[PDB]
């Protein structure tokens with residue numbers, strides 16, 4: 001077998017029907033980011049004289 | 050099924066790729082203010 005995307009040479013056999021040198025690679029990504037913030041403040045003041 | 054129906058007489062051989070990206074962003078703001086003040090005073094005086 002001719003050198004395709006590999007070593008110097010390779011040897012096939014009769015039972016093996018084919019060898020391929022077509023390099024196809026895929027990929028996928030799913031990234032997320034978030035933030036939830038809460039801030040509650042309460043105050044009271046009463047004076048009696 | 051092993052060898053096919055057609056064979057390559059003439060054509061081309063090359064590379065190809067593709068990229069797809071999706072981005073989203075959300076920003077939300079909320080503020081609250083409440084102020085209340087009350088003052089009451091009375092005075093009475095009598096002399097006889």
Ligand SMILES: *[C@@H]1O[C@H](CO)[C@@H](O)[C@H](O)[C@H]1NC(C)=O
Pocket residue numbers: 033034035036
């Ligand atoms: C708030 O959200 C921002 C958005 O990028 C993030 O960088 C930050 O770390 C968050 N803070 C938190 C969750 O306390």
